[PDB]
């Protein structure tokens, strides 16, 4: 293949192979699931488990603003850069208007930022995908961004390694998400995340992060200590 | 070779330059790190090129601040830039906030410097290549003893016991056993010395390795002298 | 060989192959149609969804550029978003420097000039989308198409995308002189539904927008209960 | 003012095939004589002699710049610069710093070695040229020099007569000036030879 | 030393391949234009064919106004010429703001040729695959009268005046027809009607299809009316009927 | 300084004085203030001599380059535009008041450019310190379509009005006639102030001034 | 953005890009120059591609200043950049020293741009050769400048296609004490020898440097010299 | 695009820079010039290209600044070039600018070694930075300064320079080096040194009865001062003798050429 070595090279069939490679990079990251309810959005992130004594920690879920947060999958450095950019833009907006940025405008800004790096010769696409969970006057929002620059407005979605199982599970309970309560939404997200784990690994607090955003709930991250309420009692019943 | 650019993606999704810089780490000396409630221990293999070299002139463990140390593996020439940047950022944090800078923040600054590589000039001069250095930053802060690991990709990861360099997989295999949450400082030191023994082609001598300790109770960094290393061995 | 790796290179027969590859990428995109009805312009696009869990309105391909102008994207959506941002910059420059809404022909020419500049330098690649500009300015209803090559052409009716030839043939059956936007919306929606293959794109939606006298000459989306069910 | 801080006066006078350029010797700081042996004349080549008057540091800086320019000109162009070209170059150099002006006031005399035509120039601090056929003068004693030259100069002078007129005018102008004096130095430039003389003056 | 034809570098034969390829982009679209000048006016006729009946015929055109007194025709890659038109207009405006007078046609052509030459010496820039034909009136000295002027600019930056010229597909046949007609009559002594008939006859003979009026667009500058304007279709129709004899 | 311009039957007549004052003292008695701009364009200047010389030389060089580029003769409006843009760019700190006169295919063109950049095209114009006394003469004797002799005499008289009523002007009248084909510049057209009461020419024999050292260098 | 050099050395020590540019510079129409004890005459060949080209609009002889002219052979658009740079250099010199630029300094200035484009990054060498003729304080001068930047001072030379034959013809005919119109006759005859058809006053452009100026010859003057050879 | 970048300033698998070596090879085909540094002056003798009958001489006044092969950098500095002449002109201008800048700053003549060093950094800069080709020219610098007297330097197209008592560059430089080693001594006069120059040149170019139309000679010596004027600055010391760079003319070069070729016969007739 002589059309995949550059970003400003079109394939003869009308393809951009570097962006496809970045999508492949996103497809190899840790699995994460986003679920949108009537008033709440819940993200579930599958972090690395310890090797029987050695617990490694890596920050995947970020808090962007009082009403916004996101989960990354893929290149962690690209996710950090995108988090810094989003936090700066949120701080700029809240300074000018004394209110949080609307989620649609935010998604447009992330899309434009992604597109800025897919057309210049001295640039490369972000090898990371994002799940944006937020709340504004228009209600709950759940977005997914890809290295190509496309932003998808989702009722429920998943991304990462072996996330097709999570997606096909969510495709059976998503139409009821508008009626499930917060606890039911968390259980659905946890089941979707568990559908993406390996054979011999069951979900537990050591290897799962739970992010929640709502109407009166600022974007809150839930980890080892605070995740006891949602993960201590939980098991996949086939 | 210049067939591919420095920002190109592999068909598997990996950046070629970053993956090539990772293989340079495995060609370097072995470095260790142990986190325990009593403190954090850094160990490193010196691998001097000759017996005429002054062993103190090739310090594999450098002091970022009085509570933060850093041990490198790979290309020591590039590691000096990272350690200097970390020192400058820690001093800036002390200047601005009148408090010691956290280990995680120092690692964040190091990775922030590391990620700034590319080829497009434009407005800012970037590095022509990523750093061929993996850093292991140890320290004591308000969250107790903390150990972090830095990659050429610019990704920081908090660890309980991590090893970098040539003897990495064997050290990890030893890590799977013989390690727990609540080892004492002496037990961690002996574990580090034994792991260096297991992955060293040369014979272990007090002047052959470098050991440093950041104590939880003291809160300060303490470089170990060859007699202290011998005392560790004589146990 | 190396004669098709960058846009700054002509072929032996005087062609720019990268622009043709971008046009080929456009030709593999979802079908869009547009009609100028002598009292306004109606544009209709089909959106193919790869997931059934997408929120309604996701991946909008029609965007308002000014009060009276809008752009539909046929091709790579992020490139279309960049082109829409450029068009919005062009439209507000006219309203701020010249205190007048931008004419449809002027906006189309600006979009074509912006798209053409990326086909002349080695450091950039052409946009992988075609832009449908629908305007109702002081020069009357205007419907233009901007090619990844940067050439702009005005139309009475136009079709783009994968199912282009059949949609164009269906558009050839309209009059465009007695045609009005009220019935043109239904005509375009029916054409899009008929020309679309139901066994390859399982999840499809029809997104229709228009700017005529009925919207006070403002480019907006249709009322939800106006397009046919199928 | 800044132009009278260092003192000094220069005057050029035109003969038939010759010109006499004369400068005073005093260098001081606004009342106090730092030295009494500081001539202000500079030789560019066998045909051009010019003097500078004004702030002494500006005199030295401008003289160094002119030396640089003339050496570069003689290196690039395999020939000696002519008087008119040299005056034009000084005009351009002075006008480049039109709003940051140098505090000098050059007085240029030149003669064609083959023709014998005499060219005199005296620009302002910003380069405004002035090319008469009788005499030019600049410095703190400019008014007295102008009066003496107007009263004594005639067209067809010999080098000796021209030198005597220039010396008398310079000494009489320096007598009425507190910032100029302490003898003089004169250069008589003819078609065939160049003579340098030092002229007795008051020690006041 | 292997490629020598993808960037603006000399071939071993001392030729620029990327500039010769841009000359083939002029004739690639298959369009043809003929420009002629009579004793008191200058006309340009360009093929304006719209195979797509759904395309608004008056939206696409190859005739552009550079200045009120200078008109232009672009033959070749349609967007490329458009870009050059913009440059030309800028090269006019700045000139108008620098000297206070309207730019002469020859000066504008020379500056446009200078712009083209830059893209043939800088590596990363692609030449514009169009031939530019500027028509206008030139103010003469010592008598004050106006004279028709045609100036062509090549993708190589070559600028040249013309009594009559052709550019595009089958331009050689049109030039041969014009040269053959020139051997008998004197083009600079003809009237506007005769010059228009000759230009349309050359355009028809080059392609051999007996064009209608909707298939061509004509631009014109006259001594009585120095402004550049397009000839209405009725006059083109009467010209074609006069030719049909 | 007094500079005057007059439009006559066919062409423009410019005039100037020749006195240059080095701050209330006469530096040169025969300064040249009618500058060259083109074969058909001239420009008299008043104010800072350095600024006038620099701007006139620069615009003349630009015009020469432009005529090399175009191949036509320079238009007076082009020189006017260049001068006015340059003078306006410096907000009047380039203190040069110019009287521009030329002949083109459009006929005679006479204008004034203020140091701040404003331009006025008029049949008769004055600039300089002695302009007002000059203008009062032009307003008293100017008529349309004068012959060359009448225009020259009127310009000389208007210059003489500034010569005798302005301490900054005098010692000659410089007259330049510009037509379609020929441009003539007369330097000694009028010399009202002649040389009266010649000098005594008191002789100083060689050797009356003592010499301390001497050095002779043969060439 | 094309900041690397296009001209590089070869294993044989040759700058093959400059050699190719020189080959391009020798493919233009024949131009020539002849010096004489009282002036220099340079003549070019304006062979229009057709009779519909308005030969008055095409120029191969250029005026650089009131005392210096030029003619070329090769790429005309490449030549026009150097012509404009030389004119600007002449104007700047007149502004700086209030004297006409000497021909040697102008030739040095032209040669520096050639070297700049043969060594700086992202550009190719020029594909034209220049014949510069002029007067200065030390007499009459005629220089040839090549794409490599090297310049020579000539008594009689030729560039373009058929230049070896023109130089061979000039060598036998040139005389050390040749005067002005004799040089014009020699130049016209040399052009006629290699001319494909008949030399008309609209087919040739000639400029004779006469004692203070370049003064491109008029059509009537060239007819007066063409009907005499 | 980066595909067509030739990568001039890059290392090769042997640690050698190919552009520098190719420039050195280019200089090998240039005309030969030989410098001899004696105790009373320095002689430069170079072969110039065969004079075409239609060549004209630029009627320059001051016929001592630049010849066909030899140029003047400063009043006390001269140079000869071998290689790309158009590249040599730019470096000569740079060297003149540097020398005059040093004279501007310190009001003293620039040291020969300092000028040699400053223009060698210019050549070195193009071999590490810029991404363009280096200068394909070698310089032979001659001059006089009060610190070391008469000096002779040679520069490579890589930034390297060396000081020599006798050296050569251009065609047959190895043969010239071999012959100069055979015949050179410290107790050598100027006229003897010039005799060594021509005798080595005429043998490298393989000619008997050395042709005057193909050889150029320049000398850096010291002459009595001419334009010393003490009255214009009484406190300045003016040296009695100043260094002078003089290019020999046709009539000045042939008296020394006659010594060289009769010496040639005197040394070749006794070999039997």
How would you portray this structure in words?
The structure is cut from a larger assembly and holds eight protein chains of eight kinds. Chain B has 235 residues and is α+β, with helices and mostly antiparallel strands. Chain B is built from six helices and nine strands, in the order αββββααβββααββα. Chain B is 32% helix and 23% strand. Chain B has a five-stranded antiparallel β-sheet with strand order 3-4-5-6-7. In chain B, α2 packs across α3 (103-115). Chain B starts with 15 loop residues before the first helix and ends with a helix. Chain C is built from five helices and ten strands, in the order αββββααββββααββ. In chain C, a hairpin with a 4-residue loop joins β3 and β4 (69-75). In chain C, α2 crosses α3 (104-116). Chain C is globular, with a radius of gyration of 17 Å. Chain C starts with 16 loop residues before the first helix and ends in a 9-residue tail after the last strand. In chain G, the strands form two sheets. In chain G, strands 3-4-5-6-7 form a five-stranded antiparallel β-sheet. A four-stranded antiparallel β-sheet of chain G has the order 8-1-2-9. Chain H is α+β, with helices and mostly antiparallel strands and 272 residues long. Chain H has a single domain (2-269), classed as Aminohydrolase, N-terminal nucleophile (Ntn) domain (Glutamine Phosphoribosylpyrophosphate, subunit 1, domain 1), CATH 3.60.20.10. Chain H is 33% helix and 23% strand. Chain H is built from six helices and ten strands, in the order αββββααββββααββα. Chain H has helices spanning 18-28, 85-106, 112-125, 173-182, 190-204, 250-268, and strands spanning 33-37, 42-47, 70-74, 77-83, 137-145, 149-155, 161-163, 166-169, 215-224, 241-247. The chains are: A alpha+beta (238), B alpha+beta (235), C alpha+beta (230), D alpha+beta (204), E alpha+beta (245), F alpha+beta (219), G alpha+beta (229), H alpha+beta (272). At the C-E interface, α3 and β7 of C face α1 and α2 of E. β11 of chain D pairs antiparallel with β13 (211-218) of chain F. The PDB classes it as hydrolase. Keywords: proteasome. Cryo-EM, Inhibitor, hydrolase. Leishmania tarentolae proteasome 20S subunit in complex with compound 2.
What is the CATH-assigned architecture of chain F?
A: 4-Layer Sandwich
Number of helical stretches of at least 4 residues of chain F: 4
**Series of H and E elements of chain D:** EEEEEEHHEEEHHEE
Described by the principal axes of the CA atoms, the overall outline of chain F is globular
- Largest β sheet strand count, sense and barrel closure of chain F: 5 strands, antiparallel
PDB class: hydrolase
Keywords: proteasome. Cryo-EM, Inhibitor, hydrolase
Entry title: Leishmania tarentolae proteasome 20S subunit in complex with compound 2
Chain A: Proteasome alpha 1 subunit, putative
């Amino acid at each position: 293949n002589e059309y995949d070595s550059d970003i400003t090279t079109w394939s003869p069939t009308g393809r951009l192979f570097q962006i496809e490679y970045a999508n492949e990079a996103v497809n190899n990251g840790s699995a994460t699931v986003g679920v949108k309810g009537k008033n709440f959005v819940v993200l579930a992130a599958l972090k690395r488990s310890p090797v029987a004594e050695l617990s490694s920690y890596q920050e995947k879920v970020f808090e962007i603003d009082e009403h916004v947060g996101m989960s990354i999958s893929g290149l962690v450095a690209d996710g950090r850069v995108l988090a810094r950019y989003l936090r700066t833009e949120c701080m700029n907006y809240r300074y000018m208007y004394s209110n949080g940025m609307p989620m649609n405008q935010m998604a447009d800004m992330i899309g434009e930022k992604h597109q800025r790096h897919i057309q210049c010769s001295g640039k490369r696409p972000f090898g990371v995908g994002l799940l944006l969970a937020g709340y504004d006057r228009q209600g709950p929002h759940l977005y997914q961004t890809v290295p190509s620059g496309d932003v998808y407005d989702y009722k429920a979605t998943a991304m990462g390694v072996r996330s097709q199982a999570s997606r096909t599970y969510l495709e059976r309970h998503f139409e009821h998400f508008s009626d499930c309560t917060l606890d039911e939404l968390v259980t659905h997200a946890l089941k979707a995340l568990a559908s993406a784990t390996s054979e011999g690994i069951e979900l537990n607090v050591k290897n799962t992060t739970i992010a929640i955003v709502g109407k009166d709930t600022p974007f809150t991250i839930f980890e080892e200590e605070s995740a006891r309420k949602y993960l201590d009692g939980f098991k996949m019943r086939p | 070779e210049y067939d591919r650019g420095v920002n190109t993606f592999s068909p598997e999704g990996r950046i070629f330059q970053i993956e090539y810089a990772v293989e340079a780490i495995k060609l370097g000396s072995t470095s260790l790190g142990i986190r325990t409630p009593e403190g954090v221990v850094l160990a490193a293999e010196k691998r001097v090129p000759s017996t005429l070299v002054v062993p103190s002139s090739m310090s594999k463990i450098m002091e970022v601040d009085s509570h933060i140390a850093a041990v490198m593996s790979g290309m020591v020439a590039d590691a000096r830039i990272l350690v200097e940047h970390a020192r400058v950022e820690s001093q800036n944090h002390r200047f601005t906030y009148n408090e010691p800078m956290s280990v995680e923040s120092c690692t964040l600054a190091t990775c922030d410097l590391s990620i700034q590589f590319g080829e497009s000039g434009g407005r800012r001069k970037l590095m022509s290549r990523p750093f061929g250095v993996s850093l292991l930053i140890a320290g004591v802060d308000e969250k107790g003893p903390q150990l972090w690991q830095t990659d050429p990709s610019g990704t920081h990861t908090r660890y309980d016991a991590q090893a970098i360099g040539g003897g990495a997989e064997a050290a990890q295999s030893v890590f799977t056993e013989r390690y727990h949450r609540n080892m004492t400082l002496e037990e961690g030191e002996t574990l580090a010395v034994d792991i260096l023994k297991q992955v060293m082609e040369d014979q272990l001598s007090p002047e052959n390795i470098e050991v440093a300790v950041v104590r939880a109770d003291d809160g300060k960094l303490h470089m170990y002298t060859p007699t202290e290393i011998k005392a560790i061995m004589s146990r | 060989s190396g004669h098709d790796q960058s846009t700054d290179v002509f072929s032996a027969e005087g062609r720019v192959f990268q622009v043709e590859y971008a046009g080929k990428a456009v030709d593999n995109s979802s079908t869009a149609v547009a009609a100028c009805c002598k009292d306004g312009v109606v544009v209709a696009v089909e959106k193919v969804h790869t997931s059934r869990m997408l929120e309604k309105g996701s991946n909008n391909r029609i965007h308002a550029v000014d009060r009276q102008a809008g752009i539909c994207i046929c091709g790579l959506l992020p490139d279309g978003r960049a082109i829409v941002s450029r068009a919005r910059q062009e439209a507000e420059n006219s309203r701020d420097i010249f205190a007048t809404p931008i004419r449809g022909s002027v906006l189309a020419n600006r979009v074509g000039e912006f798209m053409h500049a990326y086909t002349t330098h080695f450091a950039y690649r052409p946009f992988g989308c075609s832009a449908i500009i629908a305007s109702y300015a002081d020069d009357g209803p205007q419907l233009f198409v901007s090619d990844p090559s940067g050439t702009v052409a005005g139309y009475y009716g136009v079709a783009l995308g994968k199912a282009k030839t059949v949609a164009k043939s269906e558009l050839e059956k309209l009059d465009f002189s007695s045609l009005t936007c009220d019935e043109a919306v239904g005509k375009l929606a029916s054409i899009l539904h008929e020309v679309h293959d139901k066994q390859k794109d399982k999840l499809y939606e029809v997104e229709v927008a228009w700017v005529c006298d009925k919207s006070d000459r403002k480019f907006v989306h249709v009322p939800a209960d106006m397009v046919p069910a199928e | 003012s800044i132009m009278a801080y260092s003192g000094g006066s220069v005057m050029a006078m035109a003969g038939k095939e010759c010109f006499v350029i004369i400068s005073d010797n005093r260098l001081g700081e606004q009342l106090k004589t730092i030295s009494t042996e500081v001539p202000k004349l500079h030789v560019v080549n066998d045909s051009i002699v010019y003097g500078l008057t004004g702030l002494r540091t500006d005199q030295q800086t401008f003289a160094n710049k002119v030396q640089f320019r003339t050496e570069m000109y003689k290196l690039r162009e395999e020939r000696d610069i002519t008087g008119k070209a040299f005056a034009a170059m000084i005009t351009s150099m002075l006008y480049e710093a039109r709003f940051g002006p140098w505090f000098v006031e050059p007085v240029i005399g030149s003669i064609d070695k083959s023709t014998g035509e005499v060219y005199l120039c005296a620009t302002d601090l910003i380069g405004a040229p002035c090319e008469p056929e009788d005499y030019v003068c600049a410095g703190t004693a400019a008014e007295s020099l102008h009066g003496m030259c107007e009263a004594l100069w005639r067209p067809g002078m010999s080098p000796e007569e021209l030198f005597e007129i220039a010396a008398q005018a310079m000494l009489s102008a320096c007598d009425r000036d507190s910032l100029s004096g302490y003898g003089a130095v004169a250069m008589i430039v003819t078609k065939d030879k160049v003579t340098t003389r030092l002229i007795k003056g008051r020690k006041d | 030393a292997g490629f020598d034809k993808y960037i603006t570098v000399f071939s071993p034969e001392g030729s620029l391949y990327q500039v010769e390829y841009a000359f083939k982009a002029v004739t690639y679209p298959g369009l043809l234009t003929v420009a002629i000048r009579c004793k008191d006016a200058v006309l340009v006729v360009t093929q304006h064919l719209i195979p797509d009946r759904l395309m608004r015929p008056d939206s696409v055109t190859a005739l552009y106004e550079v200045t009120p007194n200078i008109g232009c025709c672009m033959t070749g890659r349609a967007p490329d010429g458009r870009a050059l038109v913009q440059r030309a207009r800028e090269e006019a405006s700045d000139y108008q703001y620098r000297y206070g007078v309207e730019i002469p046609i020859a000066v504008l052509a020379k500056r446009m040729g200078d712009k083209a030459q830059v893209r043939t010496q800088q590596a990363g820039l692609r030449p514009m695959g169009v031939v530019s034909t500027f028509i206008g009136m030139d103010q003469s000295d010592q008598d004050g009268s106006l004279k028709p002027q045609i100036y062509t600019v090549d993708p190589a930056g070559w600028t040249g005046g013309h009594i009559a010229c052709a550019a595009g597909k089958k331009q050689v046949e049109a030039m041969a027809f014009l040269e053959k007609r020139q051997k008998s009559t004197e083009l600079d002594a003809l009237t506007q009607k005769e010059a228009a008939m000759i230009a349309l006859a050359a355009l028809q003979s080059a392609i051999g299809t007996a064009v209608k009026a909707k298939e061509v667009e004509v631009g014109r500058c006259t001594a009585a009316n120095p402004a550049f304007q397009r000839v209405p279709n009725s006059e083109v129709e009467e010209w074609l009927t006069a030719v049909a004899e | 300084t007094t500079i005057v311009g007059v439009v006559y039957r066919d062409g423009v007549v410019l005039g100037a004085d020749t006195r240059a004052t080095e701050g209330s003292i006469v530096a040169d008695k025969r300064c040249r203030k009618i500058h060259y701009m083109a074969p058909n364009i001239m420009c008299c200047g008043a104010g800072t001599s350095a600024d006038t010389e620099a701007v006139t030389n620069m615009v003349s060089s630009h015009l020469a380059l432009h005529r090399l580029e175009t191949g036509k003769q320079s238009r007076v409006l082009e020189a006017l535009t260049l001068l006015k843009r340059h003078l306006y760019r410096y907000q009047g700190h380039v203190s040069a008041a110019l009287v521009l006169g030329g002949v083109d295919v459009e006929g005679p063109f006479l204008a004034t450019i203020a140091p701040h950049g404003s331009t006025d095209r008029l049949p008769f114009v004055t600039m300089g310190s002695g302009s007002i006394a000059a203008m009062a003469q032009l307003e008293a004797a100017y008529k349309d379509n004068m012959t060359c002799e009448e225009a020259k005499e009127l310009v000389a008289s208007a210059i003489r009005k500034g010569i005798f009523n302005d301490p900054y002007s005098g010692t000659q009248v410089d007259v330049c006639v510009i037509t379609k084909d020929k441009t003539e510049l007369t330097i000694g057209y009028d010399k009202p102030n002649e040389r009266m009461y010649p000098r005594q020419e008191v002789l100083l024999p060689p050797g009356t001034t003592p010499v301390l050292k001497e050095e002779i260098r043969q060439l | 953005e094309a900041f690397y050099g296009l001209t590089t050395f070869s294993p044989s020590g040759k700058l093959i890009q400059i050699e190719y540019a020189t080959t391009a510079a020798g493919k233009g129409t024949t131009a020539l120059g002849v010096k004489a004890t009282d002036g220099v005459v340079i003549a070019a060949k304006k062979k229009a591609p057709s009779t519909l080209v308005d030969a008055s609009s095409i120029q191969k002889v250029f005026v650089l200043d009131e005392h210096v002219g030029c003619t070329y052979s090769g790429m005309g658009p490449d030549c026009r950049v150097l012509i404009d740079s030389a004119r600007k250099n002449c104007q700047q010199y007149k502004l700086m020293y209030n004297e006409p630029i000497p021909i040697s300094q102008l030739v040095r200035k032209i040669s520096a741009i050639y070297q700049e484009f043969t060594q700086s990054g992202g550009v190719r060498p020029f594909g034209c050769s220049l014949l510069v003729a002029g007067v200065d304080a030390n007499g009459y001068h005629l220089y040839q400048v090549d794409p490599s930047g090297t310049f020579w001072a000539w008594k009689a030379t030729a560039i373009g296609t058929g230049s070896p034959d023109a130089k061979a013809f000039l060598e036998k005919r040139y005389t050390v004490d040749m005067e002005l119109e004799d040089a014009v006759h020699t130049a016209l005859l040399t052009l006629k020898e290699g001319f494909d058809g008949q030399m008309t006053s609209e087919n040739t452009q000639v400029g004779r440097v006469v004692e203070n100026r370049f003064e491109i010859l008029s059509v009537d003057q060239l007819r007066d010299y063409l009907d005499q050879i | 695009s980066h595909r067509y970048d030739s990568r001039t300033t890059t290392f090769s698998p042997e640690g050698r820079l190919y552009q520098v070596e190719y420039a050195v090879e280019a200089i090998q085909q240039a005309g030969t010039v030989i410098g001899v540094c004696t105790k009373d002056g320095v002689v430069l003798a170079g072969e110039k290209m065969v004079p075409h009958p239609l060549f004209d001489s630029e009627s320059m006044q001051d016929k001592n600044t630049s010849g066909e092969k030899m140029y003047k950098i400063a009043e006390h500095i001269g140079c000869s070039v071998a290689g790309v002449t158009s590249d040599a002109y730019a470096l000569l201008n740079y060297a003149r600018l540097s020398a005059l800048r040093h004279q501007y700053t310190f009001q003293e003549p620039m040291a020969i070694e300092d000028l040699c060093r400053i223009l060698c950094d210019e050549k070195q800069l193009y071999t590490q930075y810029g991404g363009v080709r280096p200068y394909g020219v070698s310089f032979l610098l001659v001059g006089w300064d009060r610190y070391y007297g008469y000096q002779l330097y040679s520069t490579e197209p890589s930034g390297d320079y060396s000081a020599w008592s006798a050296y050569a560059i251009g065609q047959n430089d190895q043969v010239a080096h071999a012959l100069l080693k055979k015949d050179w001594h410290e107790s050598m006069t100027l006229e003897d040194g010039m005799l060594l120059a021509l005798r080595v040149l005429g043998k490298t170019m393989d000619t008997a009865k050395i042709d005057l139309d193909r050889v150029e000679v320049a000398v850096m010596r010291k002459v009595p001062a001419s334009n010393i004027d003490q009255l214009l600055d009484p406190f300045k010391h003016h040296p009695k003798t100043t260094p002078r760079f003089q290019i020999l003319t046709r009539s000045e070069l042939k008296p020394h050429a006659e010594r060289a070729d009769q010496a040639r016969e005197a040394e070749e007739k006794a070999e039997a």
